[PDB]
Amino acid sequence: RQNIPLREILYQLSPYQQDVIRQTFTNAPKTFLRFFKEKGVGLATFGVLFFGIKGYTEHEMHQERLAERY
């Protein structure tokens, strides 16, 4: 099953010799900031393009409705 040549030492601890969810509270703000640091540019360019084009379209639609008035 796909022999891989490799030289290493691997260590593993029992899952009943460590904690489960206690470190999740410590790392939660750091992980939040790291997520937004990594995906900040893409989410921002998505938001700018989508909301800008939607806002321009809705504004010009409102102007079109106003132009039909008497």
């Binding site: 409705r65 106003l66 039909e68 008035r69 008497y70």
Partner: protein, 68 residues
């Protein structure tokens, strides 16, 4: 509050009408400007809708305050 057999909604709607004097002025301007029409297509439904949307948004929570 005391509930009345008469309808409180026209009185509340008349009370909110000073809060939307600008839209009323726009509607009356439209109604004056299409006075001499002859084609039968000129109407002022949009400015009317603006005025009544303002009045409705004012009077909506005050109508259900008077109803059981």
């Amino acid at each position: 509050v005391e509930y009345t057999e008469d309808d409180p909604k026209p009185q509340i709607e008349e009370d909110c009408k000073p809060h939307c004097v600008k839209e009323w002025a726009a509607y009356k301007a439209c109604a004056e400007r299409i006075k001499d029409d002859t084609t039968g297509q000129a109407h002022c439904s949009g400015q009317y809708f603006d005025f009544w949307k303002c009045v409705d948004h004012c009077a909506a929570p005050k109508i259900f305050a008077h109803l059981k």
